[model samples]
Target: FGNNVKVEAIINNWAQKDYKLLSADKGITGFSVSNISIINPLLTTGAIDYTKSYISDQNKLIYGLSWNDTDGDSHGEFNLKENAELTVSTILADNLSHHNINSWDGKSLTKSGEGTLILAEKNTYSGFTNINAGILKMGTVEAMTRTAGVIVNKGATLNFSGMNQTVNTLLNSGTVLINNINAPFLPDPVIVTGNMTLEKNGHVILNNSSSNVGQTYVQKGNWHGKGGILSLGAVLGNDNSKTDRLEIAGHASGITYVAVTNEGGSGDKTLEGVQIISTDSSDKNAFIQKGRIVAGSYDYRLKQGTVSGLNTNKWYLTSQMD
Candidate 1:
């Protein structure tokens, strides 16, 4: 008799029975239902059929699912139905345990809430999965392989959980965490098939290893950064030393802030530098230091493009200032 009422209650398919329902004012109109009733009962018959015009609205959800501890179940699916080109959304408010959508065949999935939502089964939805306000994660490495694309909005986080995964495209304005924060020593990279966009408030946090000097946090895509933070973990040494790097596969449009945390490195070098970002495009000013990146006895500055011995069009940490 609570939030899971949709799951427990009997849903009369008025639309299927060709019954015109009376509204609060006794106005009779045919109430529509989701098209995917056969596969998922909770979503098919329970939730309201969102009006077509609300397609582009980012905040609205056809079903706002919540949980009560008294209800007992911690995980379940809100199986989405294919609604053609129209997208539908679901919210997992306060349900931190983990809810999944077994299969999303068509239409986009817009997830919103304070909880974490996982794609437990393989989804073949061609529409983009929009992470509106909470954590959108994959149950397994292949959970999101068939999802057409993804967009992460501000304040939301898309976590890959320390696994190498692939996505069609990534357009982010929020936080993208590659590794599971609990065990960040392991490398987790994301491979984007198409283009990647880093908007003004976008933040991509990559976990690095101090022991593995050549370890890199990689995202493979044609990256276009309007403005955002690319945070990396490294051992603060002069350029050309051992440190973790944020590697871009194709072109990079320059990140607004390149934040670094010194993991631990022994030595330093001046003219010959340590490279942090590997890319082929030359913006010259590819990355700017957020605070100070220093190690051994010298403060390092962030520099890009043609250094003495290093590769061209990449970002490096140099001890030489100005």
Candidate 2:
């Protein structure tokens, strides 16, 4: 028996080891094969020590993506794509100021909101910012920077609450309205560079509370509007100086209207700017005072009484011959 036992001893069996990958007393872990260390992921943590082995997912980051949520509901800003539009077909309301760190970045903003939202910021989105419903109220410089386009559709209102706002193009068609009041920021002159049309019922209402200043300036572009109820004299101007003449630029082209509410103003008020070059119009107009209409330095209308204070001495009217 002793001689046969050493001759054959081959058996197939299995064993299990209760081993720990990390030491209970030590903070380091290493994987070794045949006494040669292959990888140590934990040792690559801090900048004080470096290693060539670590765990990482090859699929990680995304691009130009943004999202926001508030009140456990979907109420936050949105960072859209590079060429995407901020289209809001539902209601968006922020009754107060939300500031710079708010939500949303878009190439353009189109709100057919269903109102009662205040997104009061200097608009950065380009292209045309179209508003189909609600009252899209803004300020002097609140429309957008430089020369961007804007359109307030029929039955909507483009109201101005504070200072001035600028827009390159504004085409108000159909049953639209504009309310320009003195609020927030003031002395904000309405500057229009491109097409500023007040078609059909789209008209502007000037409201002055013996408060801040207000003015409308149109230059280099088309100042033509088929104004419905355009009123000029609302007793609004700079409080510091009531004697400052009404300064306007580039209103010299012919633009007919439906009905102008008033001629302008009086009480130490004057109108001066570039001479208005009217090609022609209808008799559906306003009541003109002596010096209320001044062309350059002279009162070109040449009324019976005193015109306002314009420095021009020349009165060249094309109607004087015809």
Candidate 3:
């Protein structure tokens, strides 16, 4: 019809052929491009070879065909062998469409690609998912790298849930926010390496990943625990600056204010090792050391709303720090 034509093919050889078209009600036949300049052609099995053309009427783009471009080039959408670790060797990404990662074994999926990716897999690629413009997303909890962890630059926003996302450190500039605070199945212990920001519109829960969790010692970056509901405690490690911090944006008079404790043995203030930067209550006992009691660290500084639920006897006043 018109200048556009539809081409289909039948396969039986199982072997590679210059295979491309089909004929009339006559049956199967040999195919040829009567005019390369006018008749576009290609093999359905291998719609590859970057610089070629085929029937132009169908709305098809071949990147998702899973062709064996063995260079680890990861052209657009590709699949990882079912039981092997796959590395996106180049700066490949789904710049065109959201890419799909078929499967990953207990090995690893090293993301060397420079493009923003939307990853969702039942993966066990613990080699570390490092992306320049990365999006750490849904899959099994074993979907992330263990030691090396996940780090993203170019100001990436980490998304979540229903998938396992345990990382060594979730970057500083990166804030962990759940799109839906009331999500029925939230990823448990959404672990991270740095400060955990409950910047989502509702509440947040940081597993209090200890400075040392079963042989794990992660950085005690500031806890930007705010939003509507701030629940749970955290076990953060000491920083190079030798100072610990917890800044809380507490709810007004009636919002639920759970005590966000910085509990870890990194330092004990009453023991006079670290320091405490408080607001009102000035009894150094206002905050404790090493999950002691009160607020936290002498080596710690805190900023929160009113004494919503803070032990007024221990903690001083509340000042919302910028």
Candidate 4:
């Protein structure tokens, strides 16, 4: 009973507060802290209804409560609300040098950097859900770094309304390049829709490393004007007769032309003329400069001299100036 002195002092303090101690006749109100024989016996036998002392036993009912308080409202459930909202003006100014802007959700990452350099790798950006519409304006954009090009995948459409930006290369896998070149402010804004086209005076040079086959280079669409023109030595393909060599869809009312020349030979062999639509099945090379207009066809060959019924789309006479 050495430590019982402290226990008796605590019991006396409780008694002075009008708390009564239960006797053996009534029942046990509290247990002895030092005496495990008395305490453990009461707990094991469930002899006491409750205990009024701190129990060091780790056996206790643990309850987990998940509470969510947002905007002064206590929501006792999982709420997936927007964490933050960002605007374009809030971010740094559009500097073409900065290409490190990226974000991510729970899964994949997103990127929204300056369109001033080439994108050869992946990037991401977060803190923004869906970019609101009408936030980007259109204008001329030049690449800050040299040799920057844009490669668009198939089935993807990038609209440039009221914009006059120019990129190094607009290489498409198997899609069209729609250009509205006759716009007001942006005059000659090339609009392509299907396969690449070289309109009258519009030229595209293919390097030696380009794919000679499986490439389709178209001309004009339905619109009518001076179609694009390719310069000399601008090779289309290894063989022009191949199906995939070049598919020239001329403008409805405009005459589209292609000039093939062997400039590196003895002299330049320039075949400069308007293409003739042939109907002859006998001579595959019987290029009749003049012919009759038949259904589903038009004349496109150049004859030796003036031929009747043939359209007069002049063919430039090739000569060697030695």
Candidate 5:
């Protein structure tokens, strides 16, 4: 035998009861639950502020409400609650337990980590700092002020994916791979107020691109390259702008060098303001002001001799050094 049930009246009755319950709980705060379903049209017509109920013969409801106009001020009042169990230590303990994160006792957030991942923290800054382990990977890092004594391991690669703001001081000892995207565009120059020393086997390779216009990138400090390769993958500069200077002291020696081929046009290889000392006996004690040389006229064979009889203070006549 099956039983037929008419729910219209039951729903009407439940709706009226639920509306009254919500009206009674006006200005009531905190979570609550009620049973059964109800639909009071009067409640929708502002007879009640809000409504709540559990599922029919179950534990939850689809709608719930509360009123804040108990004092009839016509403005909703804000309800505030505080968890007495939440202290600083307890919050930290919970976070550590959930995320498996740990921090040094009494240390600030800036001095927390001991590796490259520490750079991801928001408060990390550029300066004389020690990164004892791992690789510090960044899309673009700019030092507006100055940074010094920055050392990376031999296994790590410092890739300048692109330029950001500006870097005042930069020191890298690892392999630096510079990707060139826009031709005639220059890599962000490391503006130096003091000195920048890139020691060890450091190499800089500029990848070629379609838009590269062979612009010369300048570095202000004394570039000391003991062992490295500066490979220009594209046309470096035009005839009038190809002046790239490599200044060396008279006593500095044992430097193996290579210049990228300027395929688009003739460029100037200017060694300006470089002091040279001759090793020969006749000019043994002589100091020569080695003047500038064009890209096509550099004497690659001449080694260990003073660049003689040239003006060092004034600019020399290279095609690009106009």
Candidate 6:
């Protein structure tokens, strides 16, 4: 058509190939470039190598595609193999796209840049997906369902858009927000198969609603040997004890700072205590109470479970000292 031509190829073999670009009647083929440059004198004649295109500087870029679709879903697909790390860097402004990844073994994905990457389809990558910057948003339960793990780096956000995401392990140094997009409908919890390590600076926010008044957000495995802030949204009272909880099925170590946002309620002495966490861990100092978990005239103290018929491994807010 015109002098300006953009060459795009969906390559199955990662190894470099030598091909000449030729325009035909129905489609185009690749051969070598000297002859095409002779016909279209303006075209650059040289070996166009794709392997040497990626930059290794401090300001890193995506090794594959650069996409910004104002029209509709830009379905960019890629096949990940052994020792392959796919870096997706994007600067988006409220854009939406569905990127598919055919992940084989030994393949990991890294998300960097200032925008958000939404994973709605089923990604069964066994390697870890690292969030170095920006947001890695989830849209379905199948998203990251079979990952080796997920690591949230500094200042990055792993937003759970009301879906119950399942990962093998979760190591967080940044923020993990459980967003309730469907509002009145209760959002699903994050199910971690392996150890969930929260760094000293890691922060996890759990939502509270009428649907999940006395429920939990994270059903995790072991709580690894560090801690962070576990912010909860709830109303703490005796009879009106509305709270979100963290249920860890495995061992819980470290000291997590528990923060509560008082939505509504008044305290009463009649109620035993509002259980905030149900864990199999017997570590008494696993969670430390931060700020204030109080309501009405009665003050509340975060206590380990002790009474008979109650879960002794869990944590509760009790006004009683003994």
Best of the candidates, lDDT: 6
Model 6 misplaced regions, further than 4 Å? 1-106, 180-190, 208-215, 306-310, 320-322
lDDT of 5: 0.30
Q: Give per-residue CA lDDT, model 1, range 1-322, as digits (tens).
A: 1222122222322112121211122124222232112222324344332211111122221322222111223222232332311111222223333333323323466665444655444544455678876677665555556566888999887877665667768888998886556553653345545567888879987753344334455667677777888877776655546566777788877556878777676546666567778876756555677887666677777777435745766877777433
Estimate the lDDT of model 1: 0.56
For candidate 3, write residues 190-249 as lDDT tens digits: 333333333324333332342312211122333333333333343433321222222222
- Give Cα distance to truth, residue 256, candidate 3, Å: 22
CA RMSD per model (angstroms):
12.6, 22.1, 15.3, 27.1, 20.1, 11.6
> Per-prediction TM-score, please?
0.63, 0.41, 0.33, 0.22, 0.36, 0.65
lDDT of 6 by residue, 1-322 (tens): 4444344443332221222234343224432222222221111223111121222232222222322322232222222322323322222112244432322123455666545656655655555678877677775565766567889997888877656777678899998877643355453455645577889889887753434444456656788637688887667666347777788888888888888766666666525567888777657688888876566776777777733336778877775422
Q: Residues 1-322, candidate 2, lDDT per residue (tens digit)? A: 1222111111111011111122121113232222222221212122111111122233111111111122122213232222222322222232222322333332344544334223454545454556665555553344465435667777656664543556677677633222334344234444434555556556544433233324433232544455443433322111222211222233322232322112242222233322222212212121122233332232323221123433332111111111
Residue-by-residue lDDT tens digits, candidate 4, 1-322: 3334232212101112122222222124244333322121111133221123222343221111111111122211111112211111111111222222121122211112211111111112111111111111122232111223333333222233322333333333221222223322222323333223223343332111222212223332222313442222222222132111222233233333333332222322233422223111112212221122111122222332223323332222222223
Q: Quote the positional error of residue 129 for candidate 5 in Å.
A: 5.4
What lDDT does the true structure give each of the candidates? 0.56, 0.34, 0.32, 0.24, 0.30, 0.58
Angstrom error at residue 127, model 5: 5.5
Superposed by TM-score, candidate 6 places the C-alpha of residue 279 at a distance from the truth, in angstroms, of: 0.9
Against the correct fold, how does model 6 do in TM-score?
0.65
Error of model 6, residue 103, in angstroms: 17
- Clash-forming residue pairs, model 6: 19-31, 20-30, 20-31, 20-32
Best by TM-score: 6
The regions of model 2 sitting more than 4 angstroms off are 1-106, 139-143, 146-148, 174-193, 208-221, 234-248, 251-322
Positional deviation of residue 187's Cα in model 3 after best superposition, in angstroms: 9.9
